[PDB]
From a paper:
D592 is located in the pore loop region of the hexamer at the inter-protomer interface, indicating that interactions distal to the D1-D2 interface can also influence the coupling between these domains.
The human [name]+ [name] p97, also known as [name], a potential target for cancer therapeutics, plays a vital role in the clearing of misfolded proteins. p97 dysfunction is also known to play a crucial role in several neurodegenerative disorders, such as MultiSystem Proteinopathy 1 (MSP-1) and Familial Amyotrophic Lateral Sclerosis (ALS). pmcp97 is a member of the classic clade of [name]+ ATPases and is an essential cellular enzyme. p97 is composed of six protomers forming a homo-hexamer with an N-terminal domain (NTD) and two tandem [name] domains D1 and D2 (1). p97 is an essential protein in regulating cellular homeostasis from membrane fusion, Endoplasmic Reticulum-Associated Degradation, Mitochondrial-Associated Degradation (MAD), Chromatin-Associated Degradation to NF-κB activation (2).
Residue numbers in the entry:
A (entry chain D): 21 to 707, 728 to 775
B (entry chain E): 260 to 707, 728 to 775
The structure:
């Protein structure tokens, strides 16, 4: 038994002496809330930390940060021994000194700038011989214990004096640098990063297991994403956290060699990593190495591609090397590389969402000190087209602005800077706004994927439609047991038709938010570009991106916008079928029905929609969104007024009754006009900060009905023709 | 390995990775080495990457390698007993000079295995490990209908890796070698396979899949007149050809199906392939339209070639008029009723071998816009009209559609058929689909019973929509009577 062995895993808190344990873990080992333990690992070394309460990690695993993982020489997946230590122990004299690998540039006091704001009111239990890292001064510097009283009996106390000599010491090869790349340095990538964690955990941490079994290990991992997403960061972090010898192979570095030298350089890079097993061979750019799809210009290019292909599939076990290649675009790769044995496991790393970029900002700003009025929530929202490298550049530029506001008048003309100035240099929002306005996003044209923040509370009315949407996309994904028993497959998608500006997009986004799945949206111009551009082959890429991002919903806005541009029911001498809808149907028919992917079709002119899409099998479920009723319009305003401060004066119920033929869009622009009037009257009166009732009274003058009465009749007759519930309404069984 | 011949593997990129002139020596030395060890088999991994001399023609070394391969290929004037077997991905991606008589004449096409084929692959790849009692490979093959042989091996490996992850974490056998008393007890369950099945991306989705469909005559409701006619033109010449050559007249080349949509135009074609035990190739409307909108009509030849060497097989064209509907119809634009895709289809059908067992099935729902040039005796002369199901034809439809979902004796199927007068085959399917969806919804809602009750169909019958109205019924009937034209000669008799 020996219930003291726990699985080491990454922590969540950014502190130093923190251990995250579940309630039953301390309840089994008679451990309390505010106690200390003694973690013991390999190489005859121990560590003293503080246990904390957790409820998310696991049942029998320990969450330990990178700062303390390097102290015990224990990586992820290894096992350690934990035991309580209720013995009283105080600190008297702690002597520490940093290592010269990171102190080059520090001048002045070292206690007041790094130790005082870290050791006081913390009661961090230090251990003689441990390496702890502290952050501050827009950098990261650690410290090393060289001589102290024999451990245990080392706990920082307010009445403990600290003195240091001043010169640093050199480190050894036993410990790794804390400034390197780790799992805690990656943000905005959780679904993709977890797959890579679980994919290479066995062959790297346990190389001897695969040598004794017939299981084929994954020999190739291809990474996607626009340049700057962080593929190299993830590749280096996996190697640095799994104990594998990382070997970086740059793209242009090999191609820059002469004729025949590139072959030797690429070939010598494989056995070198094979000897240092386990190892990870990473390729920076692979589209620039083997673009053997359309280029095929030059014998040396093909020779390099063939050499790479030969060295790729020729890894018949031997060592335990895993090759992870990175590229920019999936189609820009040689198809011969995707053969089974060279590159079979495929990983797509997308642009982080709003909740992902905040983690990147927290990672990139953890070394510097910010002011109280600095919030990263608005920065992530305002930066919705940027990538991982974009935000690091934004942070660097924002940090540079603060230096410019103090270097000019202080004029520290010294060979090295002091640590007592940079700590006080707090970056404010004004520094970030200057850099945000000039940073050009590198990721704007390709489709962005989210899991939208809009929920059911933002949608007013449409209660009949909500239950229907929560009936076909949430039941097969949560309770499939009642589906395979009957032997019938679920629906492939549902089409939305009705008057424009009623919520055709809000329902699709809310159903994605509730189901916790990705959301891909295609607008009208996006569909029209591939028609006018005479290139309909881009549907396959959209469907592939949706498939491997499962679960996800495939939303097509105004699907009839391609038939409206060429007439409609009659139009020109052609019919109601074109190349883009052709390719969409072709890719939907061959789409995997067992996957969690879903397709949402939105249209405002259902009379011109091709019937070929509407058969049972592609899009059979049709839900009509009518105009909001009296109590449906009230909820629209109750949901739209949650952002702007409006007092109790405005009567929303009375406004809904007068707005009879008003769609959802009109009620939004009414509030927009009222708030614009409020802003205008505030600015004009500045030469008050609340929305009054006469604002809406004047804004109601220009209340234009976007939907007239002529199309209402057409929509209603179309709905009743497609429903056809008459005749069989009184159909009953005799006995 | 089973014939006792010395196998010599020649990789594609391995030869191309050599320098200028070294690849020639490496390829040449690989022939006499196998010749001395006769008998031997010389296998080429990738041949499209060695001799793509069809459009590439870039570089003197590439052409030199192709010419060296061609010279060493046809230069094997007996001598040894070596047989060269080359492998490639796509038939058109090969140099036509290699297909000359003497180098590569025998041609083998290996297709994607069907449902009954993938089960054997799973049994082969799982015979070394131990599975649990609740592990069945029948559903895995059905759920994996776009995967290939290597895909299923990868799926099995990934499923086996999941089981190890659930035990290595807590056991922690930190040893240089594993013990045999642990892996035997590590039984892989269905939960391990389902995780790997959901993330495995099939590599074979766009090219046409070939089967020998599992649907039989018991699944088709009614249409007894049509079954005997189908079993009359495709099963007699293939089983009893002795009475065909004696009369000196060739059998028919194909039969066209016309009628209202959703009546069984595909079920009959699949059942006639199942009964005859032959391959089935299906082409949908969008597949035909892609080669029209893409301005590339040359892909008909590949489809016909794939059908020919997969004999016996049936060539099924779904909604053949879907290409005329996209451009108008009877009048449409300033053009007529003939386009490039139908042009190529006719060109390849006229030159098709009449002695082969291949067959062509044409399906259409707007026969008025079908080009008469296809309809002459010689290409598509047999026409069979599928009318709306009658009273006793609709009962069998439900009796065949209810074989999958558990339904008690309560629901009266005979009474439902009489009220559904103007209902096609498709409407009766969606009625049952709605009823079963209601049953699933009421089971899930009541969970917070496992049988289909009678009020399920009673409520599902409210939204019974007739996909075929009355206006097109008259047009279909008048078209059928115009094409039949059996009047006038009904009382034609011989005097003596
Ligand atoms: N998801 C991320 N989390 C944290 N930092 C990131 C992320 N993505 C990129 N970065 C930062 O951007 C910098 C540049 O990354 P880069 O080398 O361009 O990645 P790639 O090679 O994948 O394009 C790195 O120093 C890294 O710190
Ligand atoms: N039912 C509704 N409840 C609340 N707001 C709505 C509703 N329908 C539309 N809106 C508002 O109208 C705006 C534009 O909607 P739009 O995308 O044009 O709808 P649709 O996709 O149906 O045309 C959205 O920002 C949304 O906030
Ligand atoms: N005669 C029939 N008997 C039983 N089921 C039928 C019949 N006709 C059609 N169906 C059902 O309708 C569904 C769709 O048929 P479909 O392919 O649209 O027919 P068609 O090719 O004639 O248009 C099929 O899944 C099939 O089960």
């Amino acid at each position: 038994n020996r219930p003291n062995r726990l699985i080491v895993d990454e922590a969540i808190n950014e502190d130093n002496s923190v251990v995250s344990l579940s309630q039953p873990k301390m309840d089994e080992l008679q451990l309390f809330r505010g106690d200390t333990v003694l973690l013991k690992g390999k190489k005859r070394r121990e560590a003293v930390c503080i246990v904390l309460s957790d409820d998310t990690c696991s049942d029998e695993k320990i969450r330990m940060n990178r700062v303390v993982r390097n102290n015990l020489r224990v990586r992820l997946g290894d096992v350690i021994s934990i035991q309580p230590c209720p013995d009283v122990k105080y600190g008297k004299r702690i002597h520490v000194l940093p290592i010269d690998d990171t102190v080059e540039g520090i001048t002045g006091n070292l206690f007041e700038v790094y130790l005082k704001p870290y050791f006081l009111e913390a009661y961090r239990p230090i251990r003689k011989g441990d390496i702890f890292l502290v952050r501050g001064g827009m950098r990261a510097v650690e410290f090393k214990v060289v001589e102290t009283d024999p451990s245990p009996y080392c706990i920082v106390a307010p009445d403990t004096v600290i003195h240091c000599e001043g010169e640093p010491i050199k480190r050894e090869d036993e410990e790794e640098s804390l400034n390197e790349v780790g799992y805690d340095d990656i943000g905005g990538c959780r679904k993709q990063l977890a797959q890579i964690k679980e994919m290479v955990e066995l062959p790297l941490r346990h190389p001897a297991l695969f040598k004794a079994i017939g299981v084929k290990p994954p020999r190739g991992i291809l990474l996607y994403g626009p340049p700057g997403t962080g593929k190299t960061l993830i590749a280096r972090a996996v190697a640095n956290e799994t104990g594998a010898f990382f070997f970086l192979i740059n793209g242009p570095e090999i191609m820059s060699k002469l004729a025949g030298e590139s072959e030797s350089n690429l070939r010598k890079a494989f056995e070198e990593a094979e000897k240092n097993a386990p190892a990870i061979i990473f390729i920076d750019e692979l589209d620039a190495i083997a673009p053997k799809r359309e280029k095929t210009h030059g014998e040396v290019e093909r020779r390099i591609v063939s050499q790479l292909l030969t060295l790729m599939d020729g890894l018949k076990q031997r060592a335990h090397v895993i090759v992870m290649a990175a590229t920019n675009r999936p189609n820009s790769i040689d198809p011969a590389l995707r053969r089974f044995g060279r590159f079979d496991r495929e990983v797509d790393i997308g642009i982080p969402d709003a909740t992902g970029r905040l983690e990147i900002l927290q990672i990139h700003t953890k070394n510097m000190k910010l002011a109280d009025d600095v919030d990263l929530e608005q920065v992530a929202n305002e930066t919705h087209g940027h990538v991982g490298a974009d935000l690091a550049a934004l942070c660097s530029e924002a940090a540079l602005q603060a230096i410019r506001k103090k270097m000019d008048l202080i004029d520290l003309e010294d060979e090295t800077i002091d640590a007592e100035v940079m700590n006080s240099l707090a970056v404010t929002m004004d520094d970030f706004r200057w850099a945000l306005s000039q940073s050009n996003p590198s990721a704007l044209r390709e489709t962005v994927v989210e899991v939208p923040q809009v929920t059911w509370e933002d949608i007013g009315g449409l209660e009949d439609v909500k239950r229907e949407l929560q009936e076909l996309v949430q039941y097969p994904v949560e309770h499939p047991d009642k589906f395979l028993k009957f032997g019938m497959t679920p629906s492939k998608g549902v089409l939305f038709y009705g008057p424009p500006g009623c919520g055709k997009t809000l329902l699709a986004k809310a159903i994605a938010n509730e189901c916790q799945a990705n959301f891909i949206s295609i607008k009208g111009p996006e569909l029209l570009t591939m028609w006018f551009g005479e290139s309909e082959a881009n549907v396959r890429e959209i469907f592939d991106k949706a498939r491997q991002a499962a679960p996800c919903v495939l939303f097509f806005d105004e699907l009839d916008s391609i038939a409206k541009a060429r007439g409609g029911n009659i139009g020109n001498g052609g019919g109601a079928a074109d190349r883009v809808i052709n390719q969409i149907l072709t890719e939907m028919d061959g789409m995997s029905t067992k996957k969690n992917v879903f397709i949402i079709g939105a249209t405002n002119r259902p009379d011109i929609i091709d019937p070929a899409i509407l058969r049972p099998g592609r899009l059979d479920q049709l839900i009509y969104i009518p105009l909001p009723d009296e109590k449906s319009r009230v909820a629209i305003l109750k949901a739209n007024l949650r952002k702007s401060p409006v007092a109790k004066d405005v009567d929303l119920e009375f406004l809904a009754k007068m707005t009879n033929g008003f769609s959802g869009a009109d009620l939004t622009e009414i509030c927009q006009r009222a708030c614009k009037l409020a802003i205008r009257e505030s600015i004009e009166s500045e030469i008050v900060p609340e929305i009054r009732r006469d604002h809406f009274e004047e804004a109601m003058r220009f209340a234009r009905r976007s939907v007239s009465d002529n199309d209402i009749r057409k929509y209603e007759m179309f709905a009743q023709t497609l429903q056809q519930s008459r005749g069989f309404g009184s159909f009953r069984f005799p006995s």
